[PDB]
Amino acid sequence: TYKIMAINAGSSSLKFQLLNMPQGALLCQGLIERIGLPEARFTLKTSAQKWQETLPIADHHEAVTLLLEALTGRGILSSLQEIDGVGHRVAHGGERFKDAALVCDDTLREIERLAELAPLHNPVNALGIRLFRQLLPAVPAVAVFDTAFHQTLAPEAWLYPLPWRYYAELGIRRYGFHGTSHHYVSSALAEKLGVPLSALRVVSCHLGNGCSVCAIKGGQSVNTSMGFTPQSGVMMGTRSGDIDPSILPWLVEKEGKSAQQLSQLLNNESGLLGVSGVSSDYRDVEQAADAGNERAALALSLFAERIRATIGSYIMQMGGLDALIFTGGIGENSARARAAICRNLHFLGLALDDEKNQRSATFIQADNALVKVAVINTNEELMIARDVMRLALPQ
Amino acid sequence: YKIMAINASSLKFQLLNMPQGAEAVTGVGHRVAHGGERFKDAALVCTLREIERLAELAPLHNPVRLFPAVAVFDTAFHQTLAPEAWLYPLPWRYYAELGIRRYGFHGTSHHYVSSALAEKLGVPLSALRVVSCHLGNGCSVCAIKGGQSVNTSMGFTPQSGVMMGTRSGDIDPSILPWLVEKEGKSAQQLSQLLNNESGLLGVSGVSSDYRDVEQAADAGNERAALALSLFAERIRATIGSYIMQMGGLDALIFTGGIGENSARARAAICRNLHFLGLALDDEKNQRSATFIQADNALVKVAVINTNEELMIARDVMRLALP
């Protein structure tokens, strides 16, 4: 048994999980938020207890110190030397990183190098790596990149139809994200079916606050809906996904919107929130819709249609479909969303069993369906801990 | 019996005897680029100053009286789209206050070729689930179910959807703010990027013309080869969306300068579609026969020459000489 810590550092936050491996049992989890701001709060939960404290937390350096002190001060660990490894979520690995990587000092520089491509995320992700190496010098660390799973896309899937130099010189191409999630659920599906992933054509829908769809054929990602950044693809909580690109120059001429305002339009005011006028939260929009808000109902319907259109593209590209996976906050819990997405797919041999779908059973396809339809809880931290075991503790 | 079809730094004309269909101009039917939301069909002209009110949305084409007449709108066929197909997931007010939504174009072409397909098969068009591919310098796909357009790939303007001669089609919208921030692009520079510099031209760096790109790829140019693959993938991804939406497919139509003539393009688009019952017959595809599916195929695949002028004439004949 090994004790592996999975870390996810944000602009103002620090999420962590401590796992018992290789079984994957959750020892503790928690969140430090509002770092460097007032209302800074530290929440820490075990299997059995919860602790919560509002207190000043200056920077991420102070956030990490409080985490480590609490692990022993709450009796979770007898000592910090019991930690066998740390995995860190990194937003963007560009083309450099095709897999999770052992953290030496010029994987950190490489991650810093890519900062240009994930400005709000990669710098702080690297800061986390730095702090833990400083405060946990003897513990090996692994970086797990949200883009790495998608590096098997072929050129005709990642090249945008712009002038060649926009890729050759500026790096503009599809990257895709949620890589760690799509990887985790597709491998989990294969173990539940008792067949290897290489035998199945799989479409994976990660539907949360951010949403993306991924086509997995022969064990490899061959397409995915997010692109150059996590804004694009299907409709999301506050992100519009794909729209007519010519709308943007129109809006600049018309409303004088800056680049920062265009990006805020696309990332923070669109999606469920922008269409419903109600909320970014699926449950809130659905509640409003059943009370007769027609914009809210339209929002939910458009949400399902955008996902259907993307699934349809990927089934075409693979030449058929053997399994469809739902995951994320919406995909795991909304029988209604899943039903709307899966309706009228007899041309694929795909239909749902209503009773199974209503209780979110693992498999929800109908008795005579040719396509397996799975509801799988995603567990990205578990997937990170397994990357730590694989690359830092190879025995 | 004597119908003229007008399309106006140009002025193209055509006069046909119906119904067999056999200043600068020193019944008639007039091509109009954008009909917005108020024209669901061709319209006897009288309409003219609401046409010009729509110049806001088609400034380069609509404004361009000199000449019974009927206006035919390239957007009109697509006004049967439901809101899930035309509403972008932007803040509501961008549709409700500024009219931003999908309109779609090539409506006359898609309408003409889909009706021609049904006539050749001897069934009502509403009996079929059809995907229509207008592939020329401009490119677009249209899904016709129950005899009505239910989706189409061009959006707010003819710039978007699939990859074309010089137009990019759809791309990650986040690229644009990034290009402004990192290269200071102006709103008009963005437009000519998306409209004039991309597509087959931009990727290949050889030509906007499919044939030119084709020749350069067979001589070993690798950007050219990649441009032709991407071109095909964009169309396939869109066809796949519309098959999903319609719940299946009865027929696939190819038209326009590329679709009517390029066996290569059609073969690459139809590759590995046995899960649909769609496969091509090499011999028929090679000579662009009217039907090119294999004889075991369940999906019909047709090559139909689009005839927008003759479709326009049938519209004035219907609404001006009933």
Ligand SMILES: Nc1ncnc2c1ncn2[C@@H]1O[C@H](COP(=O)(O)OP(=O)(O)NP(=O)(O)O)[C@@H](O)[C@H]1O
């Ligand atoms: N029982 C439920 N029924 C419907 N929607 C739910 C339910 N539980 C949660 N959600 C929605 O799921 C979404 C939350 O997704 P979640 O996967 O938890 O996002 P996240 O953890 O912030 N990161 P990400 O998944 O990448 O967006 C929100 O829209 C919630 O309203």
Ligand SMILES: Nc1ncnc2c1ncn2[C@@H]1O[C@H](COP(=O)(O)OP(=O)(O)NP(=O)(O)O)[C@@H](O)[C@H]1O
């Ligand atoms: N025999 C051919 N083989 C392949 N491509 C062809 C052939 N003949 C014409 N083309 C293509 O036809 C394209 C333009 O087709 P065409 O339908 O005439 O466009 P258009 O007349 O300008 N109007 P539009 O339909 O909007 O594109 C050119 O880019 C050529 O690549």
